[PDB]
Design a protein around this ligand. Structure first.
Ligand code: XNJ
Ligand code: XNJ
Lengths: 301, 301
């Protein structure tokens, strides 16, 4: 019983975190086999952030300009190349702790664990969702760039996020591990801002099922709605549309609790229209949308 | 910016988790140097849980009755002893991954990370507080016994919790790593139940400071209260009394924000008496009490 914001165990990623320094800029890199991945803005100078040309900046670098430190051992850089917004630093030593891994781009609405790192040293681990507007509501301070987000399936780490920047509202933007940004963001100084966000409906329903599995039932009712009628209400409250695929994905949770998806949707409609009347669900006074159906199944009975 | 339920990186603990099997019962153990620690109820049988005498049950065991598996390697048990409610299984191999460690009993109101494990395999990591009533609101399923809670200071793991049981309300009870229970709980079948709980006032204030550091200011006001007058309000809302030591511990956060502790207390009084009027603080619609002042400083600017 119980339900927590639960991250994947971070050890397999800890053994990959290194420190990358160029000039006076230090940030984190990810060391897999004989390659270190890090944000390309490590090669930026103070008089470069407006309109930097990264191709020029990298042409002017040599391998010896990159100082890479794995704990107490300096790694010798023997090649450097750019891939989109990340840098690939080839080193003369393959990481003996390289896990089985994949580079996998996630969808908005999906969740992942973040290993926050500073100076190549892991500091904390937490669970994040990719928002519909392609930002993440992370917890990051200066120096955290290069920290990664990941999921773990059996023994295999699927890296999905590398941290690059903080937007003016305090949310975070980054790339996949091929260097391609999530969302309409760039690694330079502009007026860029997070666009409008929405609530991830399928996740809210998943979390209401978690609540029922954990004995929170007060929001249940005898009503069922239609998918069309539910989605009219979702639009009004800035919720994403619910699709039949979503209904299908909630099938296992529906069967375990005996509550049809469209029955649970009638509960969500009432919560949206009436509020909670001073009650809580799984310890929250708001409808939580950063747990996927998979997250609920993995964690709950 | 941002503020998350952040756990310590779990790798140093992952390398200590093993599986302990006695008869048909499997649970988790903690392998440090040449000793494996696990809950003594692994030696219970179905016809024992009412009034078990653990001293008799252990006298009737041999080393070969304990099957200990570290990943894919079976460890040979060469000694067994009881210490309070844990078992110490001496094995013929010292764990090469033993971190620097301490066994440290925590106070109610303090926080720690939990590495939830099944069959000796780590499954997830989350952050917990020890409640004033000596329970924890964990996330645990059958098979999770022996999972541990810990903090990490520099390179040193301070183990503070081993999981033993789930109470009827779905909260969790366990021991320190010397086998001594937190709270008035026993490792046998009784009508035992969590006592009444309270809200951890100093942590709520710490979290209001986190909110101010992160730009949430709407709950601030021009008023200051006295410590005595605040505590009259705390009692009415089932909050713990605020002491001068608490005020002192909040000193750094008070200085960073420029908000006197007794000034922030006037905000908390108003939130308790009036509610939030549909607003949120750090993404929550309720006053969060599972972040210590240390947690806020560690995570925030
Ligand atoms: C997207 C991006 C582009 C370029 C840069 N780099 C710079 O602007 C930069 C780089 C170098 C310098 C020169 N030196 C200044 C003194 N320190 C050493 C470097 C000055 C400025 C940083 C970023 N990203 C950043 N992320 C953060 C950040 C803060 C908090 C949480 N998450 C990310 C701050 S700057
Ligand atoms: C405190 C305590 C005392 C004794 C026991 N053990 C038993 O009651 C027990 C032990 C052995 C057996 C016999 N066999 C039954 C079939 N499986 C193999 C064992 C039957 C019952 C367990 C516990 N603790 C438990 N924790 C949980 C639990 C569930 C969910 C989350 N966290 C803890 C379930 S039982």
């Amino acid at each position: 019983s119980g339900f927590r914001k639960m991250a994947f165990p971070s050890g397999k990623v800890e053994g990959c975190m290194v420190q990358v320094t160029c000039g006076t800029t230090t940030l984190n890199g990810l060391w897999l086999d004989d390659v270190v991945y890090c944000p390309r803005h490590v090669i930026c100078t103070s008089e470069d952030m407006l309109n930097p040309n990264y191709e020029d900046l990298l042409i002017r670098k040599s391998n010896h300009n990159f100082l890479v430190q794995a704990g107490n051992v300096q790694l010798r850089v023997i090649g450097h190349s750019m891939q989109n917004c990340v840098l690939k630093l080839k080193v003369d030593t393959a990481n003996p702790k390289t896990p089985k891994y994949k580079f996998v781009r996630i969808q908005p609405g999906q969740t992942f664990s973040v290993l926050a790192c500073y100076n190549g040293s892991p500091s904390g681990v937490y669970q994040c969702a990719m928002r519909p507007n392609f930002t993440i509501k992370g917890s990051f301070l200066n120096g955290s760039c290069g920290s990664v987000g990941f999921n773990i399936d059996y023994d295999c780490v699927s890296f999905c996020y590398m941290h690059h920047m903080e937007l003016p509202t305090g949310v975070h933007a980054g790339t996949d591990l091929e260097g391609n940004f999530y969302g309409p963001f760039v690694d330079r100084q502009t007026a860029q801002a997070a666009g409008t966000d929405t609530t991830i409906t399928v996740n809210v329903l998943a979390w209401l099922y978690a609540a029922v599995i954990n004995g929170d039932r007060w929001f249940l009712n005898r009503f069922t709605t239609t998918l069309n009628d539910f989605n009219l209400v979702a639009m009004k409250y800035n919720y994403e549309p619910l699709t039949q695929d979503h209904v299908d994905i909630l099938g296992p949770l529906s069967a375990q609790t005996g509550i049809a998806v469209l029955d649970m949707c009638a509960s969500l409609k009432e919560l949206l229209q009436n509020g909670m009347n001073g009650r809580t669900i799984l310890g929250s006074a708001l409808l939580e949308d950063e747990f996927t159906p998979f997250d609920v199944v993995r964690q709950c009975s």
